[PDB]
Amino acid sequence: DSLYPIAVLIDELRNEDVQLRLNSIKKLSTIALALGVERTRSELLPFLTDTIYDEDEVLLALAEQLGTFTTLVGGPEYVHCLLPPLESLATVEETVVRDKAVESLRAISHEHSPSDLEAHFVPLVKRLAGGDWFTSRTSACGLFSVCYPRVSSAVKAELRQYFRNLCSDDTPMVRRAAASKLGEFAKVLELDNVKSEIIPMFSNLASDEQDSVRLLAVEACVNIAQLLPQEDLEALVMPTLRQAAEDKSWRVRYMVADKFTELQKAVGPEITKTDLVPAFQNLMKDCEAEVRAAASHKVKEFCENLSADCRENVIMSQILPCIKELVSDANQHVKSALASVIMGLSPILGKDNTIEHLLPLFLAQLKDECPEVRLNIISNLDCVNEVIGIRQLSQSLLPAIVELAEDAKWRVRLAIIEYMPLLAGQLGVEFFDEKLNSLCMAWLVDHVYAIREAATSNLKKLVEKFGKEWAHATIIPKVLAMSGDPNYLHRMTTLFCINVLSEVCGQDITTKHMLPTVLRMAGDPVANVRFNVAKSLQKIGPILDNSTLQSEVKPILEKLTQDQDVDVKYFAQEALTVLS
């Protein structure tokens, strides 16, 4: 007989095409539903466990399937029958299959009830941690956090003992997995038990021979510090952080640096003032560029979170000279990392401190060769603007940013455009016309379309600020000149400018100055300009006076809706509907 689903119809699908095997595994629910649940537990699952396959994708799909097999196996009561096949998957050489198997195991952990967790899952964890192969030992690390909260105290002490043994194992990757899972595992433990069991082994992990285990130890250091009471961190976490920050390997010091802000938040401000600021100092003054860049991006977050009473003293006494040396760093990545956060110190330091100390540092970074530095500096100009006002901005930073309106990289010019409304809103018509109006016009003819779009959108805000008479005197003539340009990009740019300008220029200006220019472009040879004319007439329809619609706009749209280009037809007829 060849109709038993269990052996037959499955082991015949071992063909060369892997996708058929994944399809069989993907539809393993249907075969299981066909079988009786008792028959499934008796025959299907032992077949899966005993047999061993050698294709990573099928194994991954099989592990993913077993996480949702609780309904098709007999409910949560019999869910322990899923433990052998996933155990077999947890011992494979491939790491991804192991992680998926551990995920499925901890997903079916919830299905078990406390008694079944103690009866079946905890022996499984013991077997995995006690296995001959290290792969099972690393697999056992991720299983502790889900079995721990819902077991008896003796079993919890046992779990602590096996995690401690696993951490202190001679095998490196087992220690790596244990250190990685230490943060999650220590989350649920009792605090006194954390101090007694986790902390000594954590300190042992930080002092290990290998460097990857130390890196993962410092990773877990943040969570471990966060868990503990503040009265205990001087003797428990802080010596470990001191050890780690001075480690020979730059990877450990780096990942200390990225985690520094969370350490600051966890341990409380007085401990940071006393002990963290030399660690931050020699992280910024460190030899390696990676750790210097990692520390630089944390300067703003670190300084903002200190106690205000002793904050500025810390900043100028310890942080600021290190910043001064980082601004002239040889590596451009360090300078870029510093640039993205340096303006955040302006409200913290105050106005006079910013002018005397921070402003030369901004100016030095605004003239850097590296584009990333220049881009990161400008993006946070609103902060320094609000701090020092605009008189100091015009005195110090305005000539530097005007030089950056012609930058080689267009994202710098985009930042400058994005920061023009602020300046406009804080400066008069006369000064803006003297200095910056030509800059606003220079961008409309830029090569990059994003620059032209940003400048067009910026014109709307500029007209909103300085009124429409200023627009008629300074904005409109230079926009209309672009309509006669031989490049169709510039004609389309005027159509976009008219799109954003009709809204703010009012009925009269739109009717008599902008509309006749829009209508004469219907005879353009480029179809793109023609259907953008149709789009513009659709868009400036509401803000035109209603008298010139049927007389002037409608004949042009009627001429366009019979045009030869299909896109011109479509946009002309869409405009015709919208005009109603």
Partner: protein
């Protein structure tokens, strides 16, 4: 005033990045815009009658001297027609490397693609070539010497029908007309038998791959039999050369008629009434 106009176009719309204006483009590709190259076509009636004057002159030159069978016509000299044929070949395809009158395997059409495309383009541009071809075909043995032009035009048409993606053949009106005229000329030149000389009547009702298969059957037939002037027997009764396909041993083209009959059968819904044109006798 190219530079004067260019100076006018250099008026800066905006004051410029720093009071100094730079031109937008990095250069000009070629010598600027190409001219439109507007075409011109004369009256079609005057073209028809100019062709008539030329063809009547050529017929007078080619005809033998000369009531003598009042309903009949003079015989066109195959030597004069041969002269017309060789000068036609020289005018259209002077680079006659594969100028054997025997036809090669149809795979060789893939080696002479440029030559065949040149021939096809010249037939497209000059409609007079088809008129001269049927003038040549009026004298039977002369169209043997035009074998290279026929082969090249057939290869061009075969490539077109192979590359055609339409389901109907009328979307390529010139190629349909050219295939029809080609099969008609080689039938009138007695290079094809009556059965295989009538397929052009059903070309307009066929799909591109079907007409391609029929023209490949034509090519296969010409491989088997060949447009060789030695096959033409002079008949002193009427003073004309005659190609009798029945003595050729396969003159009906039965292997090459099987394809035509299958094409008829497949499209019998539209090609039923045309079955009479392809009867065996």
């Amino acid at each position: 005033a190219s530079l004067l106009d260019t100076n006018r176009r250099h008026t800066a719309a905006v004051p410029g990045p720093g009071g100094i204006w730079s031109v937008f483009h990095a250069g000009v590709i070629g010598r600027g815009l190409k001219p439109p190259k507007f075409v011109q076509s004369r009256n079609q009636q005057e073209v028809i009658y100019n062709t008539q004057s030329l063809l009547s002159l050529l017929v007078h030159c080619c005809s033998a001297p000369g009531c003598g069978e009042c309903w009949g016509a003079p015989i066109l000299s195959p030597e004069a027609a041969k002269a017309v044929a060789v000068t036609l070949v020289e005018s259209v395809c002077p680079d006659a490397a594969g100028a054997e009158l025997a036809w090669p395997p149809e795979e060789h059409a893939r080696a002479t693609v440029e030559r065949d495309l040149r021939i096809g383009r010249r037939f497209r541009e000059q409609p007079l070539l088809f008129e001269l071809l049927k003038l040549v075909a009026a004298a039977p043995p002369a169209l043997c010497y035009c074998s290279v032009l026929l082969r090249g035009l057939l290869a061009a048409l075969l490539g077109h029908w192979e590359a055609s993606r339409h389901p109907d053949t009328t979307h390529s009106p010139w190629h349909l007309e050219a295939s029809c005229t080609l099969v008609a000329v080689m039938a009138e030149g007695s290079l094809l038998p009556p059965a295989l000389g009538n397929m052009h009547e059903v070309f307009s009702q066929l799909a591109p791959f079907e007409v391609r298969l029929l023209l490949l059957s034509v090519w296969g037939f010409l491989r088997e039999h060949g447009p060789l002037p030695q096959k033409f027997i002079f008949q002193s009764e009427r003073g004309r050369f005659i190609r009798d396909f029945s003595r050729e041993g396969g003159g009906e083209g039965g292997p090459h008629l099987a394809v035509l009959h299958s094409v008829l059968h497949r499209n019998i819904d539209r090609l039923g009434l045309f079955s009479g044109r392809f009867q065996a006798p």
